[PDB]
């Protein structure tokens with residue numbers, strides 16, 4: 001089969017950390033695909049815990065590095081007409097949103113297409129209209145942003161209804177690994193020069209959500225999905241139809257009440273321990289992404305961590321968690 005691919009990304013020290021000359025307890029070595037953590041002692045002598053992953057990125061990693069090495073390959077499979085999912089997992093403040101969405105560089109330095117701080121989502125949409133418009137492919141693109149807060153579903157892209165409007169989900173009559181999400185708005189994206197606008201509306205809606213729900217940005221789970229309908233007309237004249245779907249999942253903070261987060265962990269454990277029963281149905285998150293966990297979707301997890309000594313317990317928790325997920329087998 002194809003085991004779930006797991007990569008670790010350690011973010012750098014923030015400006016409010018360097019002024020204190022903070023000592024890092026995290027060492028990354030991409031070539032060895034390892035991440036080493038200082039668990040005690042001194043900088044002259046100490047013990048450490050090491051873990052090997054499918055890939056490892058350190059503080060110096062740029063957004064372009066992440067996209068080229070992990071996303072590009074995945075997007076290509078999506079273009080081939082396959083289903084793919086990428087999870088962002090880790091403690092609040094470690095880089096989940098930065099990685100999945102990115103942000104705008106300060107003082108309007110670049111346009112959104114050239115902003116080096118752009119994350120996976122914008123780069124993906126942009127490239128999509130770049131690699132397909134390149135070919136004589138007849139294609140369409142739809143996006144949806146589904147968010148889960150306290151086990152309730154919200155549409156963060158519907159410009160018609162406000163966030164407070166919760167959605168309903170049901171099991172799909174056909175697909176046994178799928179569900180039906182009543183009301184989930186799907187937005188057609190005609191061209192890259194329409195991408196930014198769609199994302200801005202999402203960010204804006206997220207602000208109203210923050211107002212209404214406590215610690216919304218750290219406790220919610222978000223699923224940004226992109227579906228590509230393609231009518232390919234190869235140079236040989238044959239017209240092949242393909243449907244590609246990609247799920248960019250930004251999970252709630254993992255730091256020590258969140259039924260979806262608890263269940264995801266239990267689903268992963270059940271899968272790795274080969275336990276007969278997998279509790280997918282015990283949460284909205286796992287029911288919605290059932291196929292991404294031991295199913296027929298290509299899945300990858302980007303675990304984000306802090307290099308600060310103060311986050312040791314949480315960083316170790318994140319690594320152990322990510323480490324275990326490597327043993328999951330999809331098809």
Ligand SMILES: CN(C)CCNC(=O)NC[C@H]1CC[C@@H]2[C@H](O1)c1cc(C(F)(F)F)ccc1N[C@H]2c1ccccc1
Nearest residue numbers: 101102103104112115117118119121122199200202203
């Ligand atoms: C001023 N500096 C300090 C902060 C500015 N950052 C900011 O406003 N940031 C929010 C906005 C900024 C613009 C996009 C938006 O988040 C956004 C919303 C979603 C969502 F899931 F909601 F649909 C998904 C991805 C993105 N990516 C951002 C992006 C970043 C770079 C290039 C292209 C697109």
Ligand SMILES: Nc1ncnc2c1ncn2[C@@H]1O[C@H](COP(=O)(O)OP(=O)(O)O)[C@@H](O)[C@H]1O
Nearest residue numbers: 010011012091092093094095096097098099304
């Ligand atoms: N690789 C990185 N390089 C530079 N800054 C980063 C990086 N990862 C995160 N940050 C910054 O640290 C803060 C937390 O990142 P964020 O992605 O919002 O965390 P999370 O979504 O995991 O809570 C933001 O201010 C962000 O700009």
